[PDB]
Amino acid sequence: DRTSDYHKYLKVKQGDSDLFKLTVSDKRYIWYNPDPKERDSYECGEIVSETSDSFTFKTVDGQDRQVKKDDANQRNPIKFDGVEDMSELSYLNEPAVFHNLRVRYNQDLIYTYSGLFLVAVNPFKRIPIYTQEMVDIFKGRRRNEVAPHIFAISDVAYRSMLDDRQNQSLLITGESGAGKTENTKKVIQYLASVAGRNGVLEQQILQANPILEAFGNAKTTRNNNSSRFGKFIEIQFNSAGFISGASIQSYLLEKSRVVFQSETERNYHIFYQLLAGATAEEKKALHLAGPESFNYLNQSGCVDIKGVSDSEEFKITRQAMDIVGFSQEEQMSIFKIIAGILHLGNIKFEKGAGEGAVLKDKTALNAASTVFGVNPSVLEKALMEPRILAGRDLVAQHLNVEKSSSSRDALVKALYGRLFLWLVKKINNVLCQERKAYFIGVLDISGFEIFKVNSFEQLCINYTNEKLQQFFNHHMFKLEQEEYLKEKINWTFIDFGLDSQATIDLIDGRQPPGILALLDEQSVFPNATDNTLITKLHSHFSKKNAKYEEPRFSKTEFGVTHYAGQVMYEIQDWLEKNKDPLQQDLELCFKDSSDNVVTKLFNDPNIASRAKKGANFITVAAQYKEQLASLMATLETTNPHFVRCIIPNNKQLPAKLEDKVVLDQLRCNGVLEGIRITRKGFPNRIIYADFVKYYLLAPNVPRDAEDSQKATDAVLKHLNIDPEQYRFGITKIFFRAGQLARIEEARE
Ligand SMILES: Cc1ccc2[nH]c3c(O)cc(Br)c(Br)c3c2c1
Ligand SMILES: [Mg+2]
């Protein structure tokens, strides 16, 4: 009851007895805008009088305003305040849907169903609703039996996997720093505990994220634990139904945050966990120092995160590596690479004689060579005098300072990119015990974000977030109504106005050439510069596509109108970034290294060998588009389950819910639209034959029910369920929102 730990934090407090006096009021209020210049700051006014098609209400100041019934945003009766499934609301609109979230969010209730998907508002405070007792409660309990919780929808997916024998997937969407990553960990926590043993394999799967989070997450201005990479986690399942293995796919590692970090941002956690928290023997063994003494860590102006102990986190990272099985040496080799990368950044090239770079001080070069186990003179020549094939001859390129310091970074980014690729490979090798029968995918991705300087990585992220949103639209709006008409159910199509396939096409469109398609052309073009690229973009579709803007104010930028707003991307040096060039003498300098890992990085074809596209190597953009599209096809194979995560504010503060911010997310996520289709449509659908699965209250249910149509109708007829509430079609019976929930509860 109310004393339960679950009533305290998961269900709405029972209201005052004086509140009852108001909850029964016959009054009718309405949300309005005291300032029409701000269409997201509403206030509650009381409808005083109504004409045939108008309302008159008294503002909070007392002034009488007047509005048409068509444009009016009526307030639901306060009996709905706190309701769990928002499709049960009568007056359904942006103001009301947002108020129900203030109510719940103010009671530390962050989860709220709305239709078949789930909403999750980031609390930014540790809410004790993920303990073991919780997981035990939702084990078996139906979605309708329990309150909104990530465990609930994770169980619905699990039960839908067994009942229907179909693969599932939990698709979690949201803005940057909205709770995507945290909810995934909880989803993994639930599934593992529910379909585990009585375990090792289950313990191992849990310990994967701490590893990846150490090398994969970092501090952005939007989020102090930001996934700079995207991951799709399949939970393989046995024929019986228990977990048999797992597999992790990784995408878009922001591998240049290594060599550079924006002001107030931070490099990947793994580097700071080492310096602060490394053994005194490793410290001098790897020639380590303080964060402020390394050129790749002292530039951001920030080496410390609020309420985070890198020394303690360093413990956790290597605790997890032991559990999955990284050798005592394999771990030391990793730290060996990290130190080596830190030293590389401290190499200070200088114009010795003018013709090219000259490296006077070699203390940093050798400290990096010592760890990597490479001949420091081979590395020095491969960084500054690499060799190339001029025709068929062999020529050494006496690179200058700016061109030598870049090849340095090209190496650094290559190492870590491959290092990261190796970690996941070492993890999948121990988790892919077998190609299993069923599988549940979990999609944690780097989230839509807008920084002061937007670059290629941001485009590919937002392109992903955009592609993901349209997927939400296709299965909630387009495919849902096609099922109705596919069953001849007398449905009139509804255009909810949510479609971003235009912005997608602009980016990845092949014919006509999309943005990425031109970059590929310009990239291979030898004389292609940034001048030629940006001009080849404006001239192409400046005034030919409404999702594109050539700014009057910058010759190096272009705007794209995403589903979450317009992002002005900076084009500087995208050509090299899409080529991802790594000078070849560098690749040899390390292919002959004296370290196991470093050797496996540049000699294992799966990690070093970049695919080839006929004449030229495959580009980044071309590669990722193939990676993403491959993932999207895999998703279409499974029944999805959406979790729309929402960030309450842009300051990472708890109990500070900003109206303007939240509505922009709801407004563009289709949350409001997403309920209408659930409310005005028929969410639940089941084959007519599969419904008999026989309640011994005037029973006339033959298992082998010839003419299933009449067989099920008789049950519904006796059940005395409103026939309007359940229109049925050719092959399956369709139920309106919750109509089936009240039907299946009879058995229980
Ligand atoms: C793996 C990859 C591929 C292309 C990229 N383009 C970037 C950019 O323009 C800025 C930053 Br920071 C990064 Br990381 C990338 C990147 C990474
Ligand atoms: Mg994340």
Return the HEC string of 344-355: HHCCCCEECCCC
Q: Which amino acid is at 647?
A: I
Is CATH 1.20.58.530 what the domain over 456-579+627-636 is classified as, yes or no? yes
Contact yes or no for 742/726 (Cβ under 8 A): no
Is the CB of residue 563 less than 8 Å from the CB of residue 552?
no
Q: What share of the chain is helix, strand, coil (3-state, %, to 5)?
A: 45, 15, 40
Torsion of CA 282, 284, 288, 290, to 10 degrees: 110
Q: Cα 137 vs. chain centroid, distance in angstroms?
A: 27
Angstrom CA distances, 631 to 166, 234, 405, 442, 638, stand at 18, 11, 36, 12, 11
Q: Pick from 442, 462, 489: which is nearest to 680 by CA?
A: 489
- Spatial separation of the C-alpha atoms in residues 708 and 696, rounded to whole Å: 19
Mark whether 181 is an active-site residue.
Answer: yes
Given ligand 1 and candidates 253, 260, 455, which is best to mutate, with the most ligand atoms within 8 Å of its CB? 455
Annotated binding site for ATP: 174-181
Give residue 574 CA to ligand 1 midpoint distance, Å: 8
**Rg over CA atoms, the chain:** 29
Where is the chain discontinuous (C–N over 2.5 Å), named by the preceding residue? 198, 693
Give the whole-angstrom CA distance, residue 476 versus residue 228.
Answer: 28
- The Cβ of residue 205 has, within 10 Å, a number of other Cβ atoms equal to 26
CB 35 within 8 A of CB 41: yes
Report the chain's terminal Cα–Cα distance, integer Å: 20
- Centre of ligand 2 from the C-alpha of residue 11, in Å: 27
Q: Pocket of ligand 1, candidates 220, 226, 416, 456: which has the most ligand atoms within 8 Å of its Cβ, to mutate?
A: 456
Helix H or strand E encompassing 127: none
For residue 435, the tally of other CB atoms under 10 A from its CB is: 10
Name the structure determination technique.
X-ray
Q: Cβ(291)–Cβ(276) under 8 Å?
A: yes
Rounded CA-CA distance 6/28 in Å is 34
Using DSSP's 3-state secondary structure scheme, residue 567 falls into strand
Q: What contacts 279, CB < 8 A, 6 or more positions away?
A: none
Retrieve residue 500's tokens.
Answer: 């971003």
CA 378 to centroid of ligand 1, rounded, Å: 28
DSSP string, 460-511: HHHHHHHHHHHHHHIIIIIHHHHHHHHTT--------S---HHHHHHHH-TT
183 alpha carbon to ligand 2 midpoint, in Å?
9
State yes or no: is 177 an active-site residue. yes
User: 512 preceded by cis ω (within 30°)?
Assistant: yes
User: Helices (H) and strands (E) in the chain — how many of each?
Assistant: 28, 25
Q: Where are the alpha helices (DSSP H) in 385-455?
A: 401-431
| Distance between CA atoms of residues 281 and 168, nearest Å | 48
The binding site consists of: 174-181
> Could you tell me whether strands 111-114 and 73-74 are parallel, antiparallel, or unpaired per DSSP bridges?
unpaired
Q: Is the CB of 688 under 6 A from ligand 1?
A: no
Closest ligand, as measured to the CA of 443: 2
Q: Reply yes or no on whether 223 is catalytic.
A: yes
Rounded CA-CA distance 377/406 in Å is: 18
CATH number of 680-748: 1.20.58.60
418 lines ligand 1 (CB under 6 A): no
Answer yes or no: same fold for 456-579+627-636 and 680-748: yes
Distance separating alpha carbons of residues 176 and 445, to the nearest angstrom: 10
| 736 close to 723: Cβ distance less than 8 angstroms | no
Q: What is the full DSSP assignment across 573-590? A: THHHHHH----HHHHHHH
Ligand 1: does its nearest atom lie under 6 Å from the Cβ of 254? yes
Token pair belonging to 240: 């019986």
Give residue 319's identity as a one-letter amino acid code: Q
State which H helix or E strand residue 214 sits in.
helix 208-216
Contact 300, 262 (CB under 8 A): yes
Q: Which of 122, 173, 223, 346 is catalytic?
A: 223
Q: Which residue, 666, 619, 626, is CA-closest to 644?
A: 666
Beta strands 684-687 and 639-646: pairing type?
unpaired
CA distance 173 to 565: 16
Residue 353: C-alpha distances to residues 201, 360, 363, 371 (Å) = 60, 12, 21, 30
List, in sequence order, every beta strand (DSSP E) within 278-352: 350-351
Q: What are phi and psi of 216, to 5 degrees?
A: -105, -25
Minimal CA–CA distance to 734: which of 457, 448, 489? 489
Q: How many CB atoms lie within 10 A of CB 631?
A: 19
Non-local (6+) Cβ contacts of 738 within 8 A are 85, 87, 88, 144
What 3-state DSSP class applies to 306? coil
User: How many of the other CB atoms lie within 10 Å of CB of 280?
Assistant: 8
In which residue are the tokens 């799966």 written?
606
Q: How far apart are CA 43 and CA 50, in angstroms?
A: 19
Ligand located closest to 449 CA: 2
What lies within 8 Å, CB to CB, of 293 at 6+ separation is: none
Are the CB atoms for 246 and 416 separated by under 8 Å?
no
Give the list of residues 6+ apart from residue 639 with CB closer than 8 angstroms, or none: 157, 160, 164, 166, 167, 168, 169
Residue 240: CB atoms within 10 A of its CB come to 9
User: Interhelix angle for 401-431 vs 376-384, to 10°?
Assistant: 120
> CB–CB of 248/428 below 8 Å?
yes
Annotated resolution, angstroms: 3.2
Catalytic residue among 45, 82, 115, 447: 447
Give me the catalytic one of 100, 227, 333, 465. Answer: 227
CB atoms within 10 A of CB 371: 23
Residue 532 dihedral angles phi and psi, to the nearest 5°:
-70, -35
